[PDB]
């Protein structure tokens, strides 16, 4: 038995490991694998090419242009804060 939150974490592992196998290492999202993933995973219109390549420059820790899981946790942090800050303007 496993929660809808363990299934949420599993989905984050799913789109990560699945798209992380598009290129580079199978544990990294290259700047192409990440651009591929964001362009499917975040549907909200402004996921445009310079929005993603400047985001990428801030998600990455070293400019290797391969996103390791601890680089990728920066993405997950900002997105989980942004949906909270949305909820603070909607449920009020």
Binding positions for Ca(2+) are 28, 33, 60, 62, 64, 66, 71
Determine the 3-state secondary structure of 87 from DSSP.
Answer: helix
The smaller minimum CB distance to a second copy, of residues 6 and 64, is found at: 6
Answer yes or no: are the C-beta atoms of 75 and 59 closer than 8 Å: yes
Is 15 an interacting residue with respect to a second copy (CB under 8 A)? Answer: yes
The smaller minimum CB distance to a second copy, of residues 32 and 76, is found at: 76
Could you list the residues that contact Ca ion (CB under 5 A)? 20, 23-25, 28, 30, 33, 60, 62, 64, 66, 71
| Count of residues in the chain | 92
Is 3 an interacting residue with respect to a second copy (CB under 8 A)? Answer: yes
Radius of gyration of the chain (CA): 14
Is 62 an interacting residue with respect to a second copy (CB under 8 A)? Answer: no
The smaller minimum CB distance to Ca ion, of residues 7 and 78, is found at: 78
Determine the 3-state secondary structure of 8 from DSSP.
Answer: helix
Q: Which has the closest alpha carbon to 59: 78, 84, 82?
A: 78
């Amino acid at each position: 038995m496993e929660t809808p939150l363990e299934k949420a974490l599993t989905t984050m592992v799913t789109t990560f490991h699945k798209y992380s196998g598009r290129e580079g290492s199978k544990l990294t999202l290259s700047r192409k694998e990440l651009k591929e993933l964001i362009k499917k995973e975040l549907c909200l219109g402004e996921m445009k090419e310079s929005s993603i390549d400047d985001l990428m420059k801030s998600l990455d820790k070293n400019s290797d242009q391969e996103i390791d899981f601890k680089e990728y946790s920066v993405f997950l942090t900002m997105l989980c804060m942004a949906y909270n800050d949305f909820f603070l303007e909607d449920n009020k």
